[PDB]
Assembly symmetry: C3
Homo-oligomer: 27 residues x 3
Amino acid sequence: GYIPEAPRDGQAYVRKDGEWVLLSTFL
Amino acid sequence: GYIPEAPRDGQAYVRKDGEWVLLSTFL
Amino acid sequence: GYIPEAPRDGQAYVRKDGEWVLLSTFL
């Protein structure tokens, strides 16, 4: 389906496993 | 709600603050 | 329009060119 909004919290998110995961996880 | 399309412009985007932000911002 | 789900496969994706592209492409 379509993807719901990510957290709105001053952090960047990427799409993984049908979820929003912090970009910083990967950096 | 659901998220609208990001710019279609040859650049990658991540989701932040209910917006599409260039990935390159963080790299 | 709204964006469809990314692959659900243990990898992170970013939005580019109206598509889901592996984050690892850029790292």
